[PDB]
Design a protein around this ligand. Structure first.
Ligand code: FMI
Length: 294
């Protein structure tokens, strides 16, 4: 029961170029399969997958986390909290088939990094070395957070992932991406207009839209705006809590600051629970397809 240490182990003989190739394959497929989810593309769901496979981590005993790539196991991919992520896993299947040497955890997390960057978001340094662990290491369902709670719930919950107020608010900015799907989560609607472009729109919408507390077709409350956007109760709590509100305003007024803080928090999220040897490779910063002229 003693907390196990997960030491990053580089896939045998692999280096930056090998991973840039995987990044490129993911990026090229994101471009090709553009029709998904009414042309939103697979970017958002890949970011959600990267987060859900990392968000099971418990700092108290180092269980869960991105290291083991346990989402490949039935108990975890059937977690009600992960409904809809099967689309992201299916997307990555041909990628893993072409590059069988990459670990599942490295693939799931790299998928998120690739999606953020290809969607014009900040560069996210990424480290390789996650190693697949047995099915009995799969964390039980119920470790991911709920969306119907308040600011106090959010603050306490994220302490388990060792995230502070600024880190939590920055991470939530990813909701500028994609949308909620009634069938998956009991919530329906996008948070903004630019569904597959990474910007600080989430914060701007929270502060500038006129929100009304309504019930959706699943009988759950959510905040709606005449513009056709929505906010989860947890999203809205970010402007109800005075400490979160200050940070929301900061990001709504400084795109660069949001990008920098999100990058750090997202990398931290994807690396929680992993011990990187002193002589491990430095974090990789992948070039986008655009930067490579591809
Ligand atoms: C850093 C990234 C991130 C964080 C930290 C983070 C944190 C949290 N999220 Fe969010 N998320 C991300 C990224 C991130 N999310 C993205 C990109 C999406 C869109 C997915 C898609 O469009 O398919 C979604 C979609 C989504 C949905 C709709 C799912 C669906 O119906 O398909 C819900 C209900 C929630 C709830 C919650 C919380 C409040 C409960 C878990 C929460 O704590 N999310």
């Amino acid at each position: 029961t003693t907390p196990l240490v997960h030491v990053a182990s580089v896939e045998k003989g692999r280096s930056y170029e090998d991973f840039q190739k995987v990044y490129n394959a993911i990026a090229l497929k994101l471009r090709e399969d553009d029709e998904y989810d009414n042309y939103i593309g697979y970017g958002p769901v890949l970011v959600r997958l990267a987060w859900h496979t990392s968000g099971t981590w418990d700092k108290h005993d180092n269980t869960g986390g991105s290291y083991g790539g346990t989402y490949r196991f039935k108990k975890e991919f059937n977690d009600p909290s992960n409904a809809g992520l099967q689309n992201g896993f299916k997307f990555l299947e041909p990628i893993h088939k072409e590059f069988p040497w990459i670990s599942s955890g490295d693939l799931f997390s790299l998928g998120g990094v690739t999606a953020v960057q290809e969607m014009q978001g900040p560069k996210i340094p990424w480290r390789c070395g996650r190693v697949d662990t047995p099915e009995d290491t799969t964390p039980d369902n119920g470790r991911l957070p709920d969306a119907d709670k308040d600011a106090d719930y959010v603050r306490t919950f994220f302490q388990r992932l060792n995230m502070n107020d600024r880190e939590v608010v920055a991470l939530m900015g990813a909701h500028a991406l994609g949308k909620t799907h009634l069938k998956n989560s009991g919530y329906e609607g996008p948070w903004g207009a630019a569904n597959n472009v990474f910007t600080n729109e989430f914060y701007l919408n929270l502060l500038n839209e006129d929100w009304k507390l309504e019930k959706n077709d699943a009988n759950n409350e959510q905040w709606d705006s005449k513009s056709g956007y929505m906010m989860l109760p947890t999203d809205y709590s970010l402007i109800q809590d005075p400490k979160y509100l200050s940070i929301v305003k900061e990001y709504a007024n400084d795109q660069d600051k949001f990008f920098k803080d999100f990058s750090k928090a997202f990398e931290k999220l994807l690396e929680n629970g992993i011990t990187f040897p002193k002589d491990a490779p430095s974090p990789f910063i992948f070039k986008t397809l655009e930067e490579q002229g591809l």
